[PDB]
Design a protein around this ligand. Structure first.
Ligand code: 152
Ligand code: 152
Ligand code: 152
Ligand code: FES
Ligand code: FES
Ligand code: FES
Ligand code: FE
Ligand code: FE
Ligand code: FE
Lengths: 352, 352, 352
């Protein structure tokens, strides 16, 4: 029942953020849950986690426990992680599956393509239906070295969602096929998923909110350019910060020899599960990599987590007029907030 | 407003579990809360806890704090555990009440039958009603050596709910009257009460889910026969497992000299408080009895608690088609799931 | 949405408490939140906390984070604690502000009167509206030596809400202007705000529920007189206990040189934030004052917190008939509950 104009934030030079209800309403969240997150490609992992036959991972997004698994035939598949008998979860965590999936409850077994292998005693069950007792699939695709799922059977391909993105990312970081997961920070953040994207889409805040990092880095004339359902923040010692629709962020810091990736998995209007993954090419970490990981964990990320959490609380106040001015300038400077207008302009298209 | 056919699961040979909404909907739970648990006899304890005058226990079921108390006149009574003046709780925990109940807030005193003994200054309050300032009762009955409460004043008697059950239980365990509480495991379980019953009503899962247990024991016949709102699982050193409507289960393991009892006290659609009681006839326990209690606590029960918790999560998934096939076999073998159909057929009569 | 008669508890000699729904319903709370707490003067502190230029405190009441701040010009002001840019909270805790407020997010600065000082880069933002970018004020007034806020722009003055109260309080304690905060107990209490007022408005409970305190003191005359939206419990070495609409209580114990203040900041139907402040005229504390603080913290207050928490649980029971008799005696004795009737008669006017 809450709608946005089709031209909402179409002019970034004179633009404001959503009326606050869009950050807080459970009704708005339920619509975005089905119109956006059940019908878009959702990045869930780096390819290194699913490279070999029988490799699998599990993810939870908008209330759906999903298993992605590389088959014995090396075909990548994704399934709802729920047994078609009486609903027990099939796999937990991540690792290497055996040659069949065995349900922990009554030990029905499934091939890695989801088809029912053996249902105990089914020969003695009247009219047992073998073809509707398979695991339920969804779409999965490998794109740009990462892995995306899609709950909409009618989805096309990741490239139609993020045209040109793979090429640009492989141009910022040429070592993607050999990156390996070094650390993952798991946090349930009490902020709307769009508030966390807003926080990523500008550098207006890094001076005030990231003193130790911005003070040492003399970064001026850093540009934020929009493309097709993704954007690129590029600064100088190159920096790359990609945002991709709806809410996965890829960062290639100065060395261009490593990456950090932010995965946002919305839970409800005021809760978002975040994975903060750090990837290096070497499995054995040096102490310089170990220290860098702890700087991310204990110094950098807490500052951004605190910001979006305070904003979520303030957004409910009757003392917040309703919308915030997006501080875009004529020059599209490094401190311009125009990236927020691009993101919210796209979001508004789902609120017509 | 979610209704089931009257013939739901009337034919166990071709049957499926409830549509998933019945295990997850708060609307369904509120209906079951009032149509079943406020109008059925609810087992709360073994008789040994209330055998002497002034004995009392407290229970919480469907949001109601209940005090069950044996009066000075040796009459067993049950009351809502709330003062008639301004609503302070009257008793906590379990034990021996003094000869009057004294409310901790304004020290009104009540007799063990619920009557107001003395309300201070009531002589000076205009039109004070001594007889509607008594504790509010509900029905209680001793049946089969156990204690049942009922929130419906128009209820009849436990035998009308469970015809023949006491006669049959006393044949399975001839020493019930001499049982004493040896251990109680209290768990607030994140599963619908009906998922927990499903898990009790079949042995399809014992091989897969209780490996250490199914591996040691060579069971030479196993039958699940239905009766009158209760069922009996009987195996061969006999084993007896009774389920009684709505959700109390009584087990008589091989020795037949001790019992374990499962009490389910539903909290909401996705939460059930469970009591797992172990009763032996001797007050001082042997080292083998202590060992058996720890096997139940740390090996056996966690396996069943984990199953129902995983099922409750999987039942919410859009990848669960909706209903699960009840694996009934022609022979009604030891691993047949037909007990579930009987249970769910009874539940369905409450969703007309 | 069930309404009360205009004469509800108009006759204290024959009166009952609200039907239990008024203490538990979220719908009732939402009405009282907007009709009472967003339209009444809410006491937040003693003036001593805001006496000097740049002093500030923060409070939270009915979901609103408020900052009260004494400006460089020595004018006392209050603001919603939310940045007009993108909603980050502005200040935390209490203390001495710098000469401008700096937002932690993007470092907009505000003078202590709420007006925008500096918005970084605003010179390059098209059509930037500086005078609709100030912090949002609400009304604040110093009254009786304490500080009140009001969320209703059309509010008048505290004296219109509490006629004669300041005049009578300064007769109870003549040194209010020299008091200083000696101790504060902060508790999120799981009780409706009206249950907590009930608990304050009678001494019917002091004998049974405060045993160590009742036997210890000698009371030669104790009266509870009602006025205009406030009441006075007065005893003899005088004692004064003031309740003021809606739920701030001021205590002047026998020595009549110190004060105890209860602030209730409701959160929802079943949750109330309480501040219990103890004020002495000397800042450097004696051992007897220090001992007295601990008796309040660990002996006296826990008894009252436990009473209201148990009452809130009991009010939900179907075994509570619905309303409780207010134990008013014809002689308005020391243990008469007639004060509850006065309070509930005032509350009832909002449920017509
Ligand atoms: C894009 N930018 C620099 C604004 C956000 C940073 O990339 C934060 C991060 O990479 O975790
Ligand atoms: C009936 N059966 C054996 C399947 C369940 C077990 O009795 C559970 C139990 O004894 O606690
Ligand atoms: C009003 N009365 C005496 C009932 C309550 C006490 O004043 C509570 C208090 O002083 O904190
Ligand atoms: S739930 Fe998977 S086999 Fe029964
Ligand atoms: S509440 Fe039990 S006596 Fe007042
Ligand atoms: S939110 Fe306060 S300056 Fe950006
Ligand atoms: Fe940041
Ligand atoms: Fe089991
Ligand atoms: Fe008290």
């Amino acid at each position: 029942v809450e709608k946005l104009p089709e031209d909402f934030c179409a002019n970034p030079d004179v633009a404001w953020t959503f009326p606050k209800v869009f950050y807080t309403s459970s009704q708005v969240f339920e619509h975005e849950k089905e119109a956006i997150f059940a019908k878009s490609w959702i990045c869930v992992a780096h390819g290194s986690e699913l490279a070999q036959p029988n490799d699998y991972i599990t993810r939870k997004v908008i209330g759906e426990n999903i298993v992605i698994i590389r088959g014995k035939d090396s075909v990548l598949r994704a399934f709802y992680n729920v047994c078609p008998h009486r609903g027990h979860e099939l796999l937990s965590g991540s690792g290497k599956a055996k040659n069949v999936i065995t349900c922990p409850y009554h030990a029905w077994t499934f091939k890695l393509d989801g088809s029912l292998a053996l249902a105990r005693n089914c020969d003695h069950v009247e009219s047992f239906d073998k073809e509707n007792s398979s695991m339920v699939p969804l779409k999965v695709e490998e794109y740009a070295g990462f892995v995306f799922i899609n709950m909409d059977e009618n989805a096309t391909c990741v490239e139609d969602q993020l045209p040109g993105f793979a090429e640009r990312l492989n141009q910022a970081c040429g070592v993607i096929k050999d990156l390996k997961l070094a650390a993952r920070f798991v946090t349930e953040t009490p902020a709307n998923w769009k508030v966390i994207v807003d926080n990523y889409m500008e550098c207006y805040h890094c001076g005030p909110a990231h003193p130790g990092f911005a003070d040492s880095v003399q970064v001026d004339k850093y540009w934020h350019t929009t493309h097709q359902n993704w954007t690129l923040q590029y600064g100088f010692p190159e920096f790359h910060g990609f945002w991709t629709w709806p809410c996965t962020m890829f960062n290639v810091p100065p060395g261009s020899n490593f990456m950090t990736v932010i995965y946002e998995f919305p839970v409800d209007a005021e809760t978002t599960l975040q994975h903060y993954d750090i990837y290096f090419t070497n499995e054995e970490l040096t102490q310089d990599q170990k220290d860098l990981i702890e700087w991310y964990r204990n110094v950098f990320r807490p500052e951004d987590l605190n910001l979006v959490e305070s904003v979520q609380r303030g957004l409910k106040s009757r003392g917040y007029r309703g919308q915030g001015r997006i501080m875009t300038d004529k020059q599209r400077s490094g401190i311009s907030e125009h990236g927020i207008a691009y993101f919210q302009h796209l979001v508004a298209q789902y609120h017509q």
